[PDB]
Nucleic acid binder design. Structure first.
Ligand SMILES: [Zn+2]
Length: 241
DNA sequence: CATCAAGCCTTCCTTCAGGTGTTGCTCCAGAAAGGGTGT
């Protein structure tokens, strides 16, 4: 519940691969997940391929992967956590917009860990911190480390439901990009320029990029009700074995 | 060799063409597993 690699044996039960070396000597942190490798725990020397391009998100330059993050670099872990929230009892999916509606509005009370892929297969699990508090959520989205406050998401959603109550067409006040890629991601629309007051506009610039990315999955004409995502920890474990 | 004549009127544009067709984007921005084989 402290390091992102803890879910290897806390969220989902797993063990070392038994071809891993035993650490002898002084303390050194794992290159992935920033977990200190003590004396006696199993570790692997660093054998990343040339296709690994996340050297900028490595926690340390010790060139040693802890066994939990050896499990975390496995391909079934890589496509199993392409969109997943890992609570203290299981791994659930956030692929649907109703699942992100559940995650960023009334979050689960566990100290979870949120990963989401901005591409096909990405190293997501180890390079994000564990969110200890529901109010402050660390979301990994591709090369982006995002922080989402569900209270600010609730305030923006209440603002949007106020300015779009009674109207026939649900027009968004501020445009949000799902990929977080367009220039106008966070830019105020003309309808939102005419239908929001000044302090609401400064609020919509003042939100964090993670809240913008979350609102991108929950600001559209059909509004997703918070529905808990389907539990996928059985699918990941079966794939892992 | 000097002036006096040292213009006057009126015309002073008319119709119509006064766009048509197409184009109106393409692609990819991953990393590992599992095989080879070349130094
Ligand atoms: Zn680690």
């Amino acid at each position: 519940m402290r390091y992102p690699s803890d879910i290897v044996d806390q969220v989902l039960k797993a063990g070392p691969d038994k071809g891993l070396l035993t650490w002898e000597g002084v303390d050194a942190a794992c290159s992935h997940c920033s977990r200190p490798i003590q004396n006696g725990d199993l570790y692997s020397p660093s054998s990343v391929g040339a296709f690994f391009s996340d050297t900028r998100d490595l926690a340390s330059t010790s060139r040693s992967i802890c066994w939990r993050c050896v499990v975390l670099r496995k391909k079934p872990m890589l496509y199993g956590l392409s969109a997943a929230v890992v609570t203290q009892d299981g791994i659930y999916s956030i692929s649907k917009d109703v699942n992100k509606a559940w995650l960023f509005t009334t979050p689960p009370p566990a100290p979870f860990l949120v990963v989401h892929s901005s591409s096909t297969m990405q190293h997501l699990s180890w390079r994000t911190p564990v969110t200890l508090d529901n109010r402050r959520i660390h979301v990994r989205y591709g090369p982006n480390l995002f922080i989402v406050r569900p209270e600010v998401v609730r305030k923006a959603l209440s603002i949007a439901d106020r300015v779009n109550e009674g109207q026939k067409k649900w027009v968004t006040p501020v445009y949000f990009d799902r990929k977080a890629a367009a220039m106008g991601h966070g830019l105020i629309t003309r309808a939102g320029a005419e239908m929001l007051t000044q302090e609401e506009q400064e609020f919509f610039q003042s939100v964090t990029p993670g809240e913008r990315w979350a609102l991108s999955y929950l600001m559209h004409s059909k509004r997703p009700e918070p529905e808990v995502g389907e539990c996928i920890t059985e699918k990941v474990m079966t794939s892992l074995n």
